[PDB]
């Protein structure tokens, strides 16, 4: 039962090294082939290579050059680095266990075979964005509820997150108590070149004098956390 | 481009199949991708598929001589919609680093929605930092294609606004926002704003005033 969970800078400045790690929990580093994959706007999956289990590396001869793959045993977690990064290099990071095939169309003796390699099991992945410009925290403004009356019990209440550079933002709601009525919008990406978002909510009418509403904001990148109340 | 296009009606059987066949005996792997989210391993093997993935996606086994690669969804549905990515390993081409190219699954024929739309006044803590912006958002609307303009009173804006692309939600509706910036001395000088948002050919119109 490995849980992949991935962690970056978020920004990267161009010509400096990117840095990603895949923290593993409740499986065994050393039981498993290791991989990492990136994705970019404009392209396709991209296969950077793989690590196995006895700490042997094979290099995308594309990426190769550029890229160490390493292994931590004692924090169980492993390492993907690239060295002198450009603009091509912005991508989602995505870390995952590798497991290997092998078809034989012929005898084994003779080498006729060869071996090929899939992926199981996949972390979300990390936002990593490089650039020349540095990173911009966001600032939370709560967005009021209506009050009375809609003649449902439910008005509509939310914060808004603005001007973060880069993304992404994670939003919770009363420390993750409140998932129900949330809706968390896609960012839009500004003339300034900044991002906002707004996260939204439905509750109902009555509740609203009395009720907790506290909206987190997560900027890992900036790296700002602020917690925001909303009042009608 | 790396994508290749491909629409299907709702209810209906997705036929998918890798860019390249192979020479000899082969060991294909499937995978979906929705931008933004992890790939997931559909198939693996040919024909081999992973638990917790549904009965509906199926893959060509090679028995015999050859088979050609295919991937098949039975009845597909809006929550398929995703970029399809054919692993293909075979015994004359070596190791195959590059994932190839990938078939954007369009599912058609969903149901019209009207958009849901929320606008929200410039708050006091932003207005207390001179700045202030309008919030509207949009939801669970479909088809993604959306026409949004702000009024001043009466009369057209087009300054300072700033909107998303719509973009497919959990529930398999679009969802798009946009942003008005205001100096608050111009968000007083009007007696209301107006969110006025199109879709297919209705329109869901909003409004806030200074309080």
């Known amino acids: 039962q490995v849980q992949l969970q991935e962690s970056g800078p978020g920004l990267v400045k161009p010509s400096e090294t990117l840095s990603v790690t895949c923290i593993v929990s409740?499986?065994?580093?050393?039981?498993?082939?290791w991989t990492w994959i990136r994705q970019s706007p404009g392209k396709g999956l991209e296969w950077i290579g793989y690590?196995?289990?006895?700490?042997?590396?094979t290099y995308n001869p594309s990426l190769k050059s550029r890229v160490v793959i390493s292994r931590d045993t004692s924090k169980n977690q492993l390492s993907l680095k690239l060295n002198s990064v450009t603009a091509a290099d912005t991508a989602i990071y995505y870390c995952?266990?590798?497991?290997?095939?092998?078809?034989?169309?012929?005898?084994?003796?003779?080498?006729?075979?060869?071996?090929?390699?899939?992926?199981?099991?996949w972390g979300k992945g990390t936002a990593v964005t490089v650039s020349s410009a540095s990173t911009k925290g966001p600032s939370v403004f709560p967005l009021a509820p209506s009050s009375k009356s809609t003649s449902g019990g439910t008005a509509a209440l939310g914060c808004l997150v603005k001007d973060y550079f880069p993304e992404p933002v994670t939003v919770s709601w009363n420390s993750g108590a409140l998932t129900s009525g949330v809706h968390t919008f896609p960012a839009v990406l500004q003339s300034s070149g900044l991002y906002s978002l707004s996260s939204v909510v439905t509750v109902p009418s009555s509740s609203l004098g009395t009720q907790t509403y506290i909206c987190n904001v997560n900027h890992k990148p900036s790296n700002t956390k602020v917690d925001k109340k909303v009042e009608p | 481009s790396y994508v290749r296009p491909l629409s299907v009606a709702l209810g209906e059987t997705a036929s998918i199949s890798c860019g390249r066949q192979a020479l000899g005996s082969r060991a294909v792997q499937w995978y979906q991708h929705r931008p933004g989210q992890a790939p997931i391993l559909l198939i693996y093997n040919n024909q081999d598929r992973p638990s917790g993935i549904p009965e509906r996606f199926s893959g060509t086994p090679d028995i015999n001589f050859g088979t050609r690669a295919t991937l098949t969804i039975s009845g597909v549905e809006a929550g398929d919609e995703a970029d399809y990515y054919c692993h293909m390993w075979d015994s004359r081409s070596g190791f195959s680093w590059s994932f190839g190219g990938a078939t954007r699954l369009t599912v058609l024929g969903q149901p019209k929605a009207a958009p849901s739309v929320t606008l929200f006044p410039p708050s006091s803590e932003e207005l207390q930092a001179n700045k202030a912006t309008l919030v509207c958002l949009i939801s669970d609307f479909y088809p993604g294609a959306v026409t949004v303009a702000w009024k001043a009173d009466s009369s057209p804006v087009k300054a300072g606004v700033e909107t998303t692309t719509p973009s497919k939600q959990s529930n398999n509706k679009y969802a798009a926002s946009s942003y008005l910036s205001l100096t608050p001395e111009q968000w007083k000088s009007h007696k209301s704003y107006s969110c006025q948002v199109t879709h297919e050919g209705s329109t869901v119109e909003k409004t806030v005033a200074p309080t």
């Open positions: 995952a266990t590798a497991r290997r095939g092998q078809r034989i169309y012929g005898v084994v003796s003779f080498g006729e075979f060869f071996y090929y390699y899939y992926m199981d099991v």
């Open positions: 409740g499986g065994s580093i050393s039981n498993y082939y």
């Open positions: 690590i196995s289990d006895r700490e042997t590396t």
